[PDB]
Amino acid sequence: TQQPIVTGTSVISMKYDNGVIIAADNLGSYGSLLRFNGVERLIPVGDNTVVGISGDISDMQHIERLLKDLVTENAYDNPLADAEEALEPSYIFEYLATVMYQRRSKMNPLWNAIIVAGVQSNGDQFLRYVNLLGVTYSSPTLATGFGAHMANPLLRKVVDRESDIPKTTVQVAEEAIVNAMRVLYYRDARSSRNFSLAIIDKNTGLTFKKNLQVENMKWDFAKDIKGYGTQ
Amino acid sequence: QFNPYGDNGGTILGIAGEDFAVLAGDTRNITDYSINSRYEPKVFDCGDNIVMSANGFAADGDALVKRFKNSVKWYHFDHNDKKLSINSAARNIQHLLYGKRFFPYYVHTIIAGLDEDGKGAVYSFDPVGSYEREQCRAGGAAASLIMPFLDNQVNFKNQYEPGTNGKVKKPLKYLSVEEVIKLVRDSFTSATERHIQVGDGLEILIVTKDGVRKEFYELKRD
Amino acid sequence: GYDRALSIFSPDGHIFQVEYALEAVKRGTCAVGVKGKNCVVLGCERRSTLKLQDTRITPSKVSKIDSHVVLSFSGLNADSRILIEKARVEAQSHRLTLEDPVTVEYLTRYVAGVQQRYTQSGGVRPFGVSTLIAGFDPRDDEPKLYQTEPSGIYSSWSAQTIGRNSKTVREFLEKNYDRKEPPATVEECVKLTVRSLLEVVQTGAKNIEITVVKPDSDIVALSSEEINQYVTQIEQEKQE
Amino acid sequence: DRGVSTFSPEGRLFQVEYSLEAIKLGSTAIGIATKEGVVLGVEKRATSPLLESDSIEKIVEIDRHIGCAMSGLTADARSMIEHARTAAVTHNLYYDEDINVESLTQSVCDLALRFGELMSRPFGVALLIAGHDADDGYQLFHAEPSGTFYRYNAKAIGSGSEGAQAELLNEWHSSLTLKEAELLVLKILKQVMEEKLDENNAQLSCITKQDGFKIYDNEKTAELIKELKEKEAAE
Amino acid sequence: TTTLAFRFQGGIIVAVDSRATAGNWVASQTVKKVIEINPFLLGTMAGGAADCQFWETWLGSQFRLHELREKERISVAAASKILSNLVYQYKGAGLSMGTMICGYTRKEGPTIYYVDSDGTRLKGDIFCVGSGQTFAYGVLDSNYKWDLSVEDALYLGKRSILAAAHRDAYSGGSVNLYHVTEDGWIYHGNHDVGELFWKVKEEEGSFNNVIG
Amino acid sequence: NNYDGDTVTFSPTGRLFQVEYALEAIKQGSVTVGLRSNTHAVLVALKRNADELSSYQKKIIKCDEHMGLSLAGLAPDARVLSNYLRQQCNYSSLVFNRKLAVERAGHLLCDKAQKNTQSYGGRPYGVGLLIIGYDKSGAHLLEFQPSGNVTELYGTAIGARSQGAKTYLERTLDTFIKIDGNPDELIKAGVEAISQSLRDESLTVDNLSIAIVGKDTPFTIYDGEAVAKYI
Amino acid sequence: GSRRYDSRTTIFSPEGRLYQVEYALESISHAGTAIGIMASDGIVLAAERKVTSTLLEQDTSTEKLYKLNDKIAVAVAGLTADAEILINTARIHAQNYLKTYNEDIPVEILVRRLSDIKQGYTQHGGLRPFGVSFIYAGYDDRYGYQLYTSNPSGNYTGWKAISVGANTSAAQTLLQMDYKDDMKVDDAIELALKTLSKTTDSSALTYDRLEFATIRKGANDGEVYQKIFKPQEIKDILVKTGIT
Amino acid sequence: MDIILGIRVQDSVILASSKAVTRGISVLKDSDDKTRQLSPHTLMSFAGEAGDTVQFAEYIQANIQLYSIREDYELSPQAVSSFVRQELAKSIRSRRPYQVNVLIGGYDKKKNKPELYQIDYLGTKVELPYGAHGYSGFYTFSLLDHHYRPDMTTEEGLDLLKLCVQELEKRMPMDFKGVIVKIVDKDGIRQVDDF
Ligand SMILES: *[C@@](C)(CO)[C@](*)(O)[C@H](Cc1ccccc1)NC(=O)[C@H](Cc1ccc(OC)cc1)NC(=O)[C@H](C)NC(=O)CN1CCOCC1
Ligand SMILES: [Mg+2]
Secondary structure (H helix, E strand, O other): OOOOOEEEOOEEEEEOOOEEEEEEEOOEEEOOEEEEOOOOOEEEOOOOEEEEEEEEHHHHHHHHHHHHHHHHHHHOOOOOOOOOOOOOHHHHHHHHHHHHHHHHHOOOOOOEEEEEEEEOOOOOEEEEEEEOOOOEEEOOEEEOOHHHHHHHHHHHHHOOOHHHOOOOOHHHHHHHHHHHHHHHHHHOOOOOOEEEEEEEEOOOEEEEEEEEEOOOOOOHHHHHOOOOOOO | OOOOOOOOOOEEEEEEOOOOEEEEEEOOEEEOOEEEEOOOOOOEEOOOOEEEEEEEOHHHHHHHHHHHHHHHHHHHHHOOOOOOOHHHHHHHHHHHHHOOOOOOOOEEEEEEEEOOOOOEEEEEEOOOOOEEEEOEEEEEOOHHHHHHHHHHHOOOOOOEOOOOOOOOEOOOOOOOHHHHHHHHHHHHHHHHHHOOOOOOEEEEEEEEOOEEEEEEEEOOOO | OOOOOOOOEOOOOOEHHHHHHHHHHHHOOOEEEEEOOOOEEEEEEOOOOOOOEOOOOOOOOOEEOOOOEEEEEEEOHHHHHHHHHHHHHHHHHHHHHHOOOOOHHHHHHHHHHHHHHOOOOOOEOOOOEEEEEEEOOOOOOOOEEEEEOOOOOEEEEOEEEEOOOHHHHHHHHHHHOOOOOOOOOHHHHHHHHHHHHHOOOOOOOOOEEEEEEEOOOEEEEOOHHHHHHHHHHHHHHHOO | OOOOOOEOOOOOEHHHHHHHHHHHHOOOEEEEEOOOOEEEEEEOOOOOOOEOHHHOOOEEEEEOOEEEEEEEOHHHHHHHHHHHHHHHHHHHHHHOOOOOHHHHHHHHHHHHOOEOOOEOOOOOEEEEEEEEEOOOEEEEEEEOOOOOEEEEOEEEEOOOHHHHHHHHHHHOOOOOOHHHHHHHHHHHHHHHOOOOOOOOOEEEEEEEOOOEEEEOOHHHHHHHHHHHHHHHHOO | OOEEEEEEOOEEEEEEOOOEEEOOEEEEOOOOOEEEEEOOEEEEOOEOHHHHHHHHHHHHHHHHHHHHHHOOOOOHHHHHHHHHHHHHHOOOOOOOEEEEEEEEEOOOEEEEEEEEOOOOEEEOOEEEEOOOHHHHHHHHHHHOOOOOOHHHHHHHHHHHHHHHHHHOOOOOOEEEEEEEEOOEEEEEEEEEHHHHHHHHHHHHOOOOOOOO | OOOOOOOOOOOOOOOOHHHHHHHHHHHHOOOEEEEEOOOEEEEEEEOOEOOOOEOEOOOEEEEEOOEEEEEEEOHHHHHHHHHHHHHHHHHHHHHHOOOOOHHHHHHHHHHHHHHOOOOOOOOOOOEEEEEEEEEOOEEEEEEEOOOOOEEEOOEEEEOOOHHHHHHHHHHHHHHHOOOOOOHHHHHHHHHHHHHHHOOOOOOOOOOEEEEEEEOOEEEEEEOHHHHHHHO | OHHHHOOOOOOEOOOOOEHHHHHHHHHHOOOOOEEEEEEOOEEEEEEEOOOOOOOOOOOOOOOOEEEOOOOEEEEEEEOHHHHHHHHHHHHHHHHHHHHHHOOOOOHHHHHHHHHHHHHHHHHEOOOOOOOEEEEEEEEEOOOEEEEEEEOOOOOEEEEOEEEEOOOHHHHHHHHHHHOOOOOOHHHHHHHHHHHHHHHOOOOOOOHHHEEEEEEEOOOOOOOOEEEEOOHHHHHHHHHHOOOO | OOOEEEEEOOOOEEEEEEOOEEEOOEEEEOOOOOEEEEEOOEEEEEEEOOOHHHHHHHHHHHHHHHHHHHHOOOOOHHHHHHHHHHHHHHHOOOOOOOOEEEEEEEEEOOOOEEEEEEEOOOOOEEEOOEEEEHHHHHHHHHHHHHHOOOOOOHHHHHHHHHHHHHHHHHHOOOOOOOEEEEEEEOOEEEEEOOO
């Protein structure tokens, strides 16, 4: 039985024609206190997978160490560690999913919500979710926390079903993600302006973008709003 | 305090014919008032012409199906590739569920297939392992909506022969695969209308002596 | 824990530790069991190199396992106590779960199983004891006599003997005991048992113990004078 | 001394090979498999005439569809039978069905090599496991303390095994009736036994799909012994 | 549940309903609440359903092992005590089982044992167990005599379940009848309350509280 | 001589005699052959019987849908090791959703056999194994020895008179390696290979045992009338 | 491994004897003789100290005779260190029984349990047996005055008069000669000393080489008293019987 | 369970124990014997938590019977009661204690005296001329304080007991379906069939 102390908010993601995009802000909240501002919540595994984590940061750091150790262990006695027997997104996910469900079954959970984004060896897009309860699901768009409530509605307008994935380019997909991050900054009280974004493409590979900022914000209409009713 | 259980919604439905059996389930997955996925299958082919679904808390559902699939695998290893009969599968599942009697799998389980005489068979379980063979069973969130409709249309309950003064009951007969699928589709569309956790899509797995076939139909997405 | 495999096979296919445990039984004082038409009698030798004994308090050779079953033995005395204790505990455990006292066959099968376990368990030697288990099943009037040995094999006997010079008394019983017509009465059965011991014992004074078991938990041990009367009667008929 | 789980220079386990010598000293046990059933027969071999021979239990039921005959240090067989019975009943509990004869034999043979420095030595007893199931029909298995088991059409174990096995080689064919098999076991037992064969020192049993595993009465076996003697004199 | 079993001149009658509940939801109307342990032993089920189904099935496995080891069918007393000792080990853990071990042996004769998840074990001639036990008792007690015929005893058992099926909201579906003699148990059919109620009402003239 | 009482003792020339005596049990075992192309891998095994009344000891065991082995020596030891492989293959599937690499399978068997050769009380395994499989890097054939030594090969054979088949495969190396997309011809080469180890006896219908795994072929075993084609 | 150095203490000889038990008895046969004699109105325990030195403190010494409880005592023959292990166990076992039943432990029950402990060391554990033989002298309300003996095998028996340790063969013959059933304590005291005086390997039996004890009902009305004799009391009883 | 009484008179101990077994709103049985013979001259009655009562009584019974066989001797009532007390004293500090109260009536053959011991589930032992467990004592103790004499006969003890049962049947809320009465004396244990 835990209570989460230092926490990270939404992680959002979606599929597009050639791959997947995932994003998450760089904040480590301590309740209402916006304590830490240099926190990276997207963690790449190899050159074909990115794990995005929300929830407790101490538990996130533990999961970082597990993934780091998984890469080391996979390399042992493996001549094809950087080829046919490299770590796939589906392997990395199933490992975490197993851990998350085991920990909840021992009544000592890792207080996190996790999204594993990547591209498989045959080119197929991989995007799947897992959380502290060991619940797993997949969808063209996935999001945690406030992202589930505010990002998914916006991302589903672009990709509403499977057949919309080939019709969606990386330019359109990234634009939707960046827009969603802005909306979350408007409306989530435990979010920050600074964030990281990652693209995993079957052709161009892993592109990790750091120190992005929310921009083109509408605040000008605030000056006209006076009082709460009769002012 | 940490609560180890959750509710992932959805609903499932199994019907048995003369030489076939169907196991249907909606593809929606939810938590609270949010949709997690519009297509997340929870009806699985487990081998040996046995289809299975464990609806309720998905983490427990997946864990159970995973363990049973593994039970089928080791049954082959330990008993010279012998086919696991549907009745034997049912008893095995009881022990899996009752093994966690004091920390239960929060799921209503249904399996379907053919018995050893080639006739359609549906078995259904409570969360802790009590089971029973039936012609008909709905499970999950909308079970309370669908089940009485099945009693009426599959087992012809409360239906009498016209003009017999409510003395002669409507005779029991097997339904064709065409007629069964009609009832499944109408059952789910009706459930989708009145239950918020049911919708998005319908996936049916049909089991005959020839194998396991699939059919998919759209459901309302609101 | 001490793990050594003490009981093991030899090239010729023998387990010497089990066979040497039989030699300890062969050294032990003679014990005999004879079952009649409505009773079983257990006879036991007591060596007479021990005078100044206190027979009130000295452990008796025949032991009650329950009110309806008895156990005599030949071999190591200290070892026998362990088997008797276990048997007595199992007797009470059976009454507690099955709500019925043990059958003589069941009690024998248990004791035999304990003996067998000590022949293929690590760190232990076999029991240097063979037992004669006799009695009557609950609500039954058919007499029961069983034998066990260090190896763990057990079997039913119309009459049997174990211990030192047992092959002599077995020879006697083999020609004197009729299967078609067992000792019809208690007196006949006791006499045949005393006769068989008199082939081996020495004197019929404080050397022979006799215990009679009858149906429905009716067990009694004979005193010196009672046994001495059989000894006096047999010797007078012998001089012929 | 030397280790219990030691290999000889020829590549065999000393203790396993020595236990096989103990089995050769044991009383004879014969099994024959037909399309109408499997027959099991044993030599009782009472050490003394005072011993009540009907208490000699060398043929044993494991389940309704599986029977077992033994030879060697027969005290060692008790825990093997207990395990077999539990395995059979446990499988019925878990799977609501009868357990395959082969699967049962394999479970018993898993105990065999669980010895060393687990129990202190191998078993000094060989088993003939006979049964029926829906898949592979009537079956006969020979289970050794090596952990190995062979299926047989017919098999003899014990002191008169090599002589009896050679006799079974000539006599067995795939069209044997149950009655023919019963007489054949009695015939071959009488040949290898020291004392003269009768209903008190030899025991018969069989397993059929319809009636399951049955140990024959001394009255039933006696008639088969009488039927056997008449048929040999008839030519 | 409503289950009963009573001893009489012609052996033992055993009668049970077939309803399964999950709160006020009717989970099933066709459940088997009698388990046939062997040709001479029956077990009734009341309370938690997996608990009953699992442990009474396990129970049959233990009794099979007894007759293999002892070459003799297990006694009703020993049978009921295996179960009572089992549930006693689980006492406090939350098992829910109201059971009746009914059967015949030579040494005992016809015997009934009540065993529950509290550890209570009682030999007796008449018992009713379950949510509707009181409704069954009311009819059964007021009509019971030792000298009932096999035909009358079968009917009284059937009628007592029907009574409880009617009044108890957590009982119903159908009636399963059994008769235990010196030759073993004999099944006397499944009787749907849907037809049985009106058949009994008309023929018997009872159930005048209901609109005919 | 004085240094063969147990596995924990070295000889003066640095030999482990108990391991060598375990190796001797393999030479007494019946012959079995292994070979592969680039698409398929084949096991051929000569089964042995006690006499004409007995069955023929089954030599081939399935480990997973994509992996299995043949045995030579103590069969119970093969059962223990094969069971361990089944578990390890199964652990890889449940936890990582990953088919176990045939190379890792060999490494795991090596390490299991080794522990038995360095500790007091225990004994070495008394069996040799030929493992075949098809994984992400194509077809594979391994040779396990109970000393711990595992070796990857194009083809090989173990058991009594295995030198005959091993010589044949050494000659035929260039031919059978290029039997791609043709199961029956690769088996024919394996059946011809095992024939070089035969003396007085010939291959009959209930004597021969064949197994195959490949690109679009799960690990399956052929016995009885199914191998009559190849005689 | 370690198999090489195992003596295998709990095995049978080809003749069916326990090597270590037999060799422990051989050890005990060299220990100072201890005699127990049971009379109708009490029990005597006499024991010869092992070759005494003149500078040994005699009055504050305990080698042979030990008190188990108020009603039971033992005479020791063998390794004293081994005996003290068993004595402390026996003392505890007596108190466990008293705590459980609120009654003093019956003599046989105490003897059986101590004998069962010895038995265990001959059947399992791979350890050497205890090189000790006891003479138990005690009283309870069931059997009255009782004498027992136990030895390394774990076998025990009851006696009217018995010796353990050295020269038991000669000692038992002398006891068997002069013992009779209607004997009193004071007579048994004299018999015990006379027997030691003849069987002793020493030149002459003196007070400083003896331990002595009696268990009488010589207290006031229906109760038992244990008297472990002081040096001066042994000196007086030795003069009173005319040995010195 | 509920009503168990005990009365020690000149030459015997008399135990009376209610016959009802109730669960919920149903009397499941009206002929229940709430006692076990521990030895020929020692009887133990019991009352308390369902299941625990019989399980405890039979467990003690097995132990005393085992002792009897081992020593070929009957333990005194005092000795049995002390054994029982210690078992309950262990129990109370266990994970799940036996919730059982007992009366032990016995005849000491060595002293030629009847003895009655009252022991509750905590392991609280007292020797008494008369005893009771549960709510019964709130009526019977004062009644016996008045009517009991130490030199009474067995017949006088039974009449004294009838006076207790009558009072309980008059003033107790629950129907306990009468009592089974048993007498313990020099000749052993016997049941009064007509009470
Ligand atoms: C009548 C209907 C009153 O319930 C009977 O007692 C009936 C008996 C019965 C026996 C065998 C098979 C089916 C039915 N009992 C039930 O139907 C039973 C009632 C019950 C529910 C919960 C309980 O808590 C321990 C006790 C009794 N119903 C069930 O067992 C239902 C089908 N399953 C569940 O409620 C699942 N629960 C069980 C407890 O653990 C959590 C999951
Ligand atoms: Mg909506």
